[PDB]
Amino acid sequence: QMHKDGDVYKYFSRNGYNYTDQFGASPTEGSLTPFIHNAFKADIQICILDGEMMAYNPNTQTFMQK
DNA sequence: AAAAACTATGCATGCTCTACTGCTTCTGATCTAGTCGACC
C-alpha cells in the first residue's frame, strides 16, 4: 500500500512493515517512486493506493513469478 | 757501570651494533556453512 502526500511517499507491506526504504520516500531516491512520480496527475496531491509488486522483465516484456 | 721508572704493545673479555636465519604467534583476507526477515 502506497501513500502519496505531495512529494512524500510511504510504502507499507501486508503486515504494516515500512518498506519505504526499498521503494523510496521521495523521488530523489528509491526504486519505484523516482520513475512513477511522472505518471501522477497534477490534481492529485493526496492519494492512497493498494496493489501488487512484481518483477517485470523487458527482454520478455512480462512479469516473473516469485 | 748498574738498578729503577715510564712507555710501547698486544692479546684476551665483554659489550654493542649489525645483520641473518629459524620458530612461534597475531592479524587480515578469503571461502563455506549456517541463520534471520520479508514475503507468499
UniProtKB/Swiss-Prot annotation:
The protein's name in its UniProt record: DNA ligase 4
Protein's cellular compartments: Nucleus
Organism: Homo sapiens
Family: Belongs to the ATP-dependent DNA ligase family.
Entry binding sites for Mg(2+) 1: 52
Tissue expression pattern: Testis, thymus, prostate and heart.
Disease entry from the Swiss-Prot or TrEMBL record: LIG4 syndrome: Characterized by immunodeficiency and developmental and growth delay. Patients display unusual facial features, microcephaly, growth and/or developmental delay, pancytopenia, and various skin abnormalities. Severe combined immunodeficiency autosomal recessive T-cell-negative/B-cell-negative/NK-cell-positive with sensitivity to ionizing radiation: A form of severe combined immunodeficiency, a genetically and clinically heterogeneous group of rare congenital disorders characterized by impairment of both humoral and cell-mediated immunity, leukopenia, and low or absent antibody levels. Patients present in infancy with recurrent, persistent infections by opportunistic organisms.
Gene: LIG4
Assembly notes: Interacts with XRCC4; the LIG4-XRCC4 subcomplex has a 1:2 stoichiometry and XRCC4 is required for LIG4 stability. Component of the core long-range non-homologous end joining (NHEJ) complex (also named DNA-PK complex) composed of PRKDC, LIG4, XRCC4, XRCC6/Ku70, XRCC5/Ku86 and NHEJ1/XLF. Additional component of the NHEJ complex includes PAXX. Following autophosphorylation, PRKDC dissociates from DNA, leading to formation of the short-range NHEJ complex, composed of LIG4, XRCC4, XRCC6/Ku70, XRCC5/Ku86 and NHEJ1/XLF. Interacts with DCLRE1C; the interaction is direct. Interacts with APLF.
Function: DNA ligase involved in DNA non-homologous end joining (NHEJ); required for double-strand break (DSB) repair and V(D)J recombination. Catalyzes the NHEJ ligation step of the broken DNA during DSB repair by resealing the DNA breaks after the gap filling is completed. Joins single-strand breaks in a double-stranded polydeoxynucleotide in an ATP-dependent reaction. LIG4 is mechanistically flexible: it can ligate nicks as well as compatible DNA overhangs alone, while in the presence of XRCC4, it can ligate ends with 2-nucleotides (nt) microhomology and 1-nt gaps.
Chain positions recorded as ATP binding sites: 52, 66
